[PDB]
């Protein structure tokens, strides 16, 4: 049996966080997505020559069910803490998301990655250095991604798998 990594996407709502996972799963050149089927959140990948299965939980749209975060977060081994580079509030919310992840997992060292998403052609309010500084302070990687071009998507996910493997 190949290794299965249970990943959880966390972040502010209303700022296109769903693109990160939709773009990973979708084959480029197919823009047709059905969130109803199993294949929409499970993907077989080869990372550093070792085949594995990524199971990704993204509860995009259920942000108001604030008392369901612990439940959802406990399913994960690895986390993608996502903010929009055009929304400073989503960036500022990362500190509390991470604190909950640490509490839920009962660990100060939980495999985690900071993802800055460029969700539209709105102006950037979060400079690369601000996010690179925050990521360093937590001792975790920082990956910027483009929702339009798929740039950085695979690197975000693969860097998380490496963080889990090297845990």
């Amino acid at each position: 049996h190949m290794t299965e990594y249970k990943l959880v996407v966390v972040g502010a709502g209303g700022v296109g966080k769903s693109a990160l996972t939709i773009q990973l799963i979708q084959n480029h050149f197919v823009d047709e997505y059905d969130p109803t089927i199993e294949d929409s959140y499970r993907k077989q990948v080869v990372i550093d020559g070792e085949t594995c299965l990524l199971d990704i939980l993204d509860t995009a749209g259920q942000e108001e069910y604030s008392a369901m975060r612990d439940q959802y977060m406990r399913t994960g081994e690895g986390f993608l803490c996502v903010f929009a580079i055009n929304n400073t509030k989503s960036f500022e919310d990362i500190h509390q998301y991470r604190e909950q992840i640490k509490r839920v997992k009962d660990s100060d060292d939980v495999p985690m990655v900071l993802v800055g998403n460029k969700c539209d052609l709105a102006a950037r309010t979060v400079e690369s250095r601000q996010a690179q500084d925050l990521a360093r302070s937590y001792g975790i990687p920082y990956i910027e991604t483009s929702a339009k071009t798929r740039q950085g998507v695979e690197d975000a996910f693969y860097t998380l798998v490496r963080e889990i493997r090297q845990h």
Binding site: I22, D34, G61, E64, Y65, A67, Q71, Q96, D106
Partner: protein
């Protein structure tokens, strides 16, 4: 023979540059499934001469606002109705094209005012224009449908057997001052919360969901019934956690967790999956999950009940999804799944498909969203055969476990309460005094009267 596109836009023939279809046909009607098309071609097919297409009309009128404004739609359906002429040919055209088309636009107007009246409540000029158009419609064949539309508009402008006996425990009828988790009957907590949650579920309209408007800046204006529903659910999870971690005495806290699991058992009986999950979320919260000394003293029967409920949520709601599909109404579904599937359908599919350089509206994306809102509505029809208790109802409606505190403040307080009552190893387990001056024994989940 139809007139020129230069005089009547809907005469323009079909091509790969203006309308494309799916490989399959409408399951029950043998009609082709439109994949994408131009607004003119979608409006043509909305009011097609060959056949009536209720599914497409139902889908269109639910999801059109993402690609066409209500004013622009009314303009388009008025244009469609105003058919110019291009004898044997003229009499056949009047009967095989003008009469069927004019009738189909009247059915659209009728479906619009009946099922999507909010567009009119929100734009009084849109209704002024609808009424003006409906006034200019003439013909003996139309009068029947014109009167019906007018009858709906004016109605919109105006605006079973015996249920089980209400169950009581320590708290008696009228004595609201003593109502609490352990004093009210576990069966009545579950029934009265099922009624509240059922009504909250049934008040959510597709207008609050289509366009993922509950996630946008104006969510408080556009999705108010959905948010009240989510906020009640959130409040009950937080209330359940608060009850647990504020019962510092272990024996009393074992009694609290055990009673909440009994409330869960009844939510399962009633098919209240929102209620089931309110309890699973509280149990899996950081303050409650870690209470090993409390869960060790919980009866195995109750451990197994909670464990099966938890498993509904496992593997992206696999067992929840199958269980919901198998039961029949009345039930209270968990809305969160629908919310995520609508959002991801809209965000994961393009608004437009391009064919031979021409932009086509992606209708299939919209159909997929209308499929989710239709499944929400199928569970909104049937009510529960349960008598409301106005004082128990009010007690749950006014629960405010957070008080004046903010989310961080409150959830940190709950977690710090958890660490106080059951410290982190190897700190010894302290003892705490009792807070309940009434019996902790449960009356059970089986009704007390036949």
């Amino acid at each position: 023979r139809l007139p020129s596109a230069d005089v009547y836009r809907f005469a323009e023939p079909d091509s790969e540059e203006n309308i494309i279809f799916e490989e399959n046909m409408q399951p029950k009607a043998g009609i082709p499934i439109i994949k994408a098309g131009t607004v003119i071609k979608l409006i043509e097919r909305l009011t097609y001469h060959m056949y009536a297409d209720p599914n497409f009309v139902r889908t269109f009128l639910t999801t059109y606002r993402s690609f066409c404004k209500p004013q622009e739609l009314l303009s388009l359906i008025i244009e469609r109705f105003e058919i110019p002429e291009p004898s044997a040919e003229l009499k056949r055209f009047r009967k095989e094209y003008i009469q069927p088309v004019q009738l189909r636009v009247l059915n659209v107007c009728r479906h619009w005012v009946e099922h999507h009246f909010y567009d009119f409540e929100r734009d009084a000029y849109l209704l002024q224009r609808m009424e003006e158009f409906i006034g200019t419609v003439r013909g003996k064949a139309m009068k029947k449908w014109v009167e019906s539309i007018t009858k709906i508009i004016q109605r919109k402008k105006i605006a079973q057997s015996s249920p089980p006996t209400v169950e009581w425990h320590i708290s008696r009828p009228g004595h609201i001052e003593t109502f609490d988790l352990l004093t009210l009957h576990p069966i009545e907590i579950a029934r009265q919360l099922t009624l509240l949650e059922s009504d909250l579920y049934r008040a959510v309209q597709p207008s609050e969901l289509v366009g993922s408007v509950w996630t946008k800046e104006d969510k408080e204006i556009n999705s108010p019934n959905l948010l009240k529903m989510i906020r009640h659910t959130t409040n009950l999870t937080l209330w359940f956690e608060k009850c647990i971690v504020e019962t510092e005495n272990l024996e009393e806290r074992v009694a609290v967790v055990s009673r909440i699991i009994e409330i869960l058992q009844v939510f399962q009986e009633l098919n209240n999956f929102n209620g089931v999950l309110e309890v699973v979320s509280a149990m899996n919260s950081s303050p409650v999950y870690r209470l090993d000394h409390t869960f060790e003293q919980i009866p195995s029967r109750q451990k197994k009940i909670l464990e099966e409920a938890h498993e509904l949520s496992e593997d992206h709601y696999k067992k929840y999804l199958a269980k919901l599909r198998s039961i029949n109404p009345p039930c209270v579904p968990f809305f969160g799944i629908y919310l995520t599937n609508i959002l991801k359908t809209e965000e994961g599919n393009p608004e437009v498909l391009k064919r031979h350089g021409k932009e086509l509206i992606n209708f299939s994306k919209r159909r997929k969203v209308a499929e989710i809102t239709g499944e929400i509505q199928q569970y909104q029809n049937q009510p529960y055969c349960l008598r409301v208790e106005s004082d128990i109802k009010r007690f749950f409606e006014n629960l405010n476990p957070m008080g004046n505190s903010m989310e961080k403040e409150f959830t940190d307080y709950l977690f710090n309460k958890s660490l106080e009552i059951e410290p982190r190893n190897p700190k010894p387990l302290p003892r705490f005094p009792k807070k309940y001056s009434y019996p902790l024994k449960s009356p059970g989940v089986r009704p007390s009267n036949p």
